[PDB]
Design a protein around this ligand. Structure first.
Ligand SMILES: Nc1ccn([C@@H]2O[C@H](COP(=O)(O)CP(=O)(O)OP(=O)(O)O)[C@@H](O)[C@H]2O)c(=O)n1
Ligand SMILES: [Mn+2]
Ligand SMILES: [Mn+2]
Length: 347
DNA sequence: TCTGGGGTCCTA
DNA sequence: TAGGACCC
């Protein structure tokens, strides 16, 4: 009768996992990131607890910046293995409900629920909250709509430890005067381009002439922005396993690199680590991309397609160093990265 | 106490 | 192939 999309998102996920092994820190500023040493430059916070966010600290903020704003915080090192496991357990529980479940991120998933005319999608959401709490001790919030984009927007209102329903009835009323980058899939660049067209809010964008948007953004993107402004989005929740298109590793060096020999051997290392992981996953490499960023934060990526797909390490390393070779080391290097694109056609 | 790391996909 | 743009 009525299809609902429920977006379930774990609250302050990494901090919550940390709070499981350190319950005395509940209600205190806890900042996860780096090796838990707040003075290291070139590292960021990966999760701030809600109490640390009152001091302005947020994921993405450098650790040194977070130490300046919240001197009393307990800084904890990032524990990805713990976070990976705590996510695996949460999602396994979420599928156990029997609904389509689509996992996005370590801390989120969408769940499809066709419900009729009783009952209430909120009670599904309440049971989801009660289940994950009693089995995992972790708190989630749940945004409810009929499509993924709108449900995800609804979750931002549901936080923390809550539930929120956002549909055609209350879309525009809720969303109308908000800036266009509150829409999932619109960010600061599209926002500035819209502001140069006289469009500063979701309501403005939802009534904008399609041709103005398709001329400026593309015949498909212009229409999509209109759809998203009117509250629409992807409605189907797929339970099929995700098959990654690429795998990559980048590294920002604690001190800018001046020696070619160090650059080659970092590229070689990144290539060989990434290749070893994708081979573990039974994948084959199609393209090799190498990223260079300079001390002035100037970032370019070059990519080369291999003659045929392969997992040959000598071929992949040489590919990576040839692609690196087309750059200039005119300036010192802040970061190098390798990304390996992967064959999709088979598993 | 400048500016992380992991990804996807439109379009030129 | 480049790279702009957005997301978690
Ligand atoms: N730039 C970023 C942005 C996000 N992340 C990571 O992805 C998770 C996204 O959270 P989520 O934004 O979907 C919210 P979360 O931070 O758990 O707290 P909330 O529940 O109150 O929103 C973050 O906590 C970060 O670890 C990152 O590594 N780099
Ligand atoms: Mn979260
Ligand atoms: Mn999330």
């Amino acid at each position: 009768m009525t299809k609902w999309v429920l977006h379930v998102d774990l609250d302050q996920f990494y901090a919550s996992v940390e709070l499981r092994r350190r319950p005395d820190l509940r209600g205190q500023p806890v900042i996860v990131g780096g090796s838990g040493d707040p003075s290291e430059p070139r590292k960021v916070v990966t999760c701030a607890s809600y109490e640390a966010r009152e001091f302005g600290v947020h994921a993405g903020m450098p650790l040194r910046a977070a130490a300046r704003r919240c001197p009393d915080a307990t800084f904890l090192p990032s524990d990805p293995a713990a976070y990976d496991e705590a996510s695996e357990q949460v999602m396994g529980l979420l599928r156990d409900l029997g609904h389509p479940l689509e996992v996005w991120g370590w801390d989120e998933a969408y769940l499809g629920a066709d419900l009729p005319d009783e009952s209430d999608p909120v009670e599904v959401a309440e049971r989801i909250r009660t289940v994950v709490a009693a089995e995992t001790g972790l708190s989630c919030s749940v945004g409810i709509s009929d499509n993924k984009q709108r449900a995800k927007v609804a979750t931002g209102f549901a936080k923390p430890a809550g539930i929120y329903v956002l549909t055609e009835a209350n879309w525009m009323t809720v969303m109308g005067d908000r800036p266009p980058d509150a829409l999932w899939g619109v960010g600061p660049k599209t926002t500035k381009k819209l502001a140069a067209m006289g469009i500063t809010t979701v309501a403005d964008l939802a009534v904008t002439d399609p041709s103005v948007l398709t001329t400026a953004f593309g015949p498909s993107t212009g229409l999509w922005l209109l759809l998203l402004a009117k509250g629409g989005g992807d409605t189907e929740v797929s339970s099929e396993p995700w098959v990654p298109r690429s795998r990559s590793h980048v590294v920002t060096f604690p001190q800018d690199l001046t020696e070619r020999r160090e650059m080659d051997s970092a590229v070689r290392d990144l290539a060989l680590q990434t290749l070893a992981e994708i081979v573990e996953q039974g994948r084959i490499v199609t393209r090799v991309a190498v990223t260079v960023r300079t001390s002035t934060f100037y970032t370019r990526t070059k990519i080369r397609k291999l003659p045929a797909p392969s997992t040959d390490a000598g071929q992949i390393v040489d590919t990576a160093l040839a692609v690196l070779d087309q750059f200039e080391l005119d300036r010192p290097v802040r970061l190098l990265g390798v990304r390996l694109e992967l064959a999709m056609d088979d598993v």
